[PDB]
């Protein structure tokens, strides 16, 4: 009876997890009524941005490699908060997935289905243990590439999220898993001076450094970015399809652009910086302490 459920879903802004940083796990499911199981090594990040007065954004990013082939995906969600003229609360979902090997593939698909989040869902974690989690249903933005090859082997289109413990941003030096000066993002420098937060992001290809100011906080700290006038964000060939998407958004960005930053610890007790630019074609910067 999904159509009836979606009909009600439309009448209220989309239910999302509390604003913050999440771990995402791509799941497999065997049947429309079977319990989804997380898939090894198909983990990612998800970010729910704070609720706007008009819109709430969120995103999910996943990077996976097999052989010499990378498959990178981002899902970008926009949930309207105010009502539409038909009394509806629009939801928009976009998947961009790129497959980079000897050949190249990009698949981008939007869908405006409303009932795409599920709260307290049973999920078989990586140990075979059933647990409960928010679940995204990204089935309608597709799971295959055009040659009938699946984007991620076993992926059902369902995505579990788990809240990550985030520290506040400290004064430190970071690196977006990079490096010559040809990459999209390079050094990232953060200063936390008694709560006042400044973040400097070098964009080596664009030839500029963006600087953001904000206030330190547990979870997401809101930044206002400047520096865009000094940058050349163009469509490359040196960039991946998704990077060119990020470039297209950054080329239209202007001073006082909003971003959110937080830190957390990954596996080997190694801290990571995450900066997310809402409504910027999925721009997500992750950086290792250095
Ligand atoms: Cl489900």
Residue numbers in the entry: 1 to 179, 182 to 292
What do the paper's sentences say?
Using the gnotobiotic zebrafish model, we identified a potent immune modulatory protein secreted by Aeromonas, which we named Aeromonas immune modulator A (AimA) because it reduces intestinal inflammation. To understand the molecular mechanism of AimA’s function, we determined the protein crystal structure, which revealed two related calycin-like domains that are structurally similar to the immune modulatory factor found in mammals, lipocalin-2 (LCN2). Consistent with AimA targeting the host immune response, as opposed to counteracting a specific bacterial product, we showed that purified AimA, and each of its subdomains, prevents chemically induced intestinal inflammation.
The structure of AimA revealed two domains connected by a short linker. β-strands dominate each domain with the carboxy terminal (C-term) domain forming a complete β-barrel and the amino terminal (N-term) domain containing a curved β-sheet. Therefore, we performed structural homology searches against each domain separately, which revealed that both domains had similarity to proteins in the calycin superfamily. The C-term domain of AimA has structural homology both to avidins and lipocalins. However, in comparison to the wide enterobactin-binding cleft (calyx) of LCN2, the homologous regions of the N- and C-term domains of AimA are much narrower, are occluded by loops or a helix, and lack the enterobactin-interacting residues of LCN. Residues 180–181 are at the tip of a disordered loop and were not modeled, and residues 293–294 and the C-terminal His-tag beyond it are not visible in the electron density.
